[PDB]
């Protein structure tokens, strides 16, 4: 995340770091005792020797993987949305089953998911979090970062990212002048909006042209478009 600040401990208790072969490689969101939501491109090609994965929850600093605030689980199952197209970025969304359930604590707790016609209009200020790059060309922060970014209207998303076919299963967010964005390493993590005083997961960090660039808002898989698939894959 570029243009953000250190998150406090327990700030985003659904935020998870996906370690693979011992290293953070993507983020994800806890959506229940047993299930994670992430980006498909995070798990594509890694749906084989699952013991390489470790879901790290309640994490603040990567250097403090060992705190008793931290819960860590093996990943048992990976379910990539059937419409995923790695070339076009459509349906870049997947679910991961935790091998043993997590306990809900101060530091670990699922997020509510955006519904069908819950309204999230352009201009709305939402939050992103992750352990991704500080900037395009910055370093990787030890401590989890958070930033506030505004949602951008669908038509603008597509004008600004003509390199892609921007669909109804995507959203985008960022500032015209740039400076605040999700970057490499943030993929799979959350875009969450405060809605009637309740944190709700709206997007899954998916792709972008660079990070934090002027008129290049980051793009996110739109949670509300995958409601039924998410529901059915549960447990």
Residue numbers in the entry: 795 to 814, 816 to 956, 956A, 957 to 968, 968A, 969 to 970, 970A, 970B, ...
Quote the study's own text:
Because of the unique specificity, enteropeptidase could be used as a tool for the production of recombinant fusion proteins. Especially the recombinant enteropeptidase light chain (EPL), which contains a catalytic domain, is of large interest to be applied in biopharmaceutical industry. Recently, the enteropeptidase from medaka had been reported to be a more effective tool, because of its much stricter specific for the D4K sequence compared to its mammalian counterparts. Therefore, we sought to solve the crystal structure of the light chain of medaka enteropeptidase (MEPL), and gain insights into the determinants for its stricter specificity.
The structure of MEPL displays a typical α/β trypsin—like serine protease fold. It consists of two six-stranded β-barrels (β1–β6 and β7–β12), either of which makes up about one half of the entire molecule. Superimposing of MEPL with the bovine enteropeptidase light chain resulted in an rmsd of 0.79 Å for the Ca coordinates. The differences are mainly located in the loop regions, such as the so-called ‘131-loop’ that connects strand β7 and β8. MEPL also contains, relative to bovine enzyme, an additional small 310-helix between the strand β4 and β5. Compared with BEPL and HEPL, MEPL shows much less activity for the peptide substrates with arginine at P1 site, which indicates its restriction for the entrance of arginine residues. In MEPL structure, MEPLE136 makes three hydrogen bonds with MEPLR213, while there are no similar interactions in BEPL because it is BEPLL213, BEPLY136 in these positions as well as the same situation for the HEPL structure. In addition, MEPLV209 and MEPLG210 with short side chains are covered and fixed by the side chains of four residues (MEPLE136, MEPLE163, MEPLR213 and MEPLR216), reducing the mobility of “208-loop” and strand β11 in MEPL. Moreover, we observed that the imidazole group of MEPLH24 could form a hydrogen bond with the main chain oxygen atom of MEPLG185, which could help improving the structural rigidity of “174-loop”. Over all, the unique residue interactions in MEPL may reduce the flexibility of the specific pocket, restricting the entrance of arginine residue which has larger side chain.
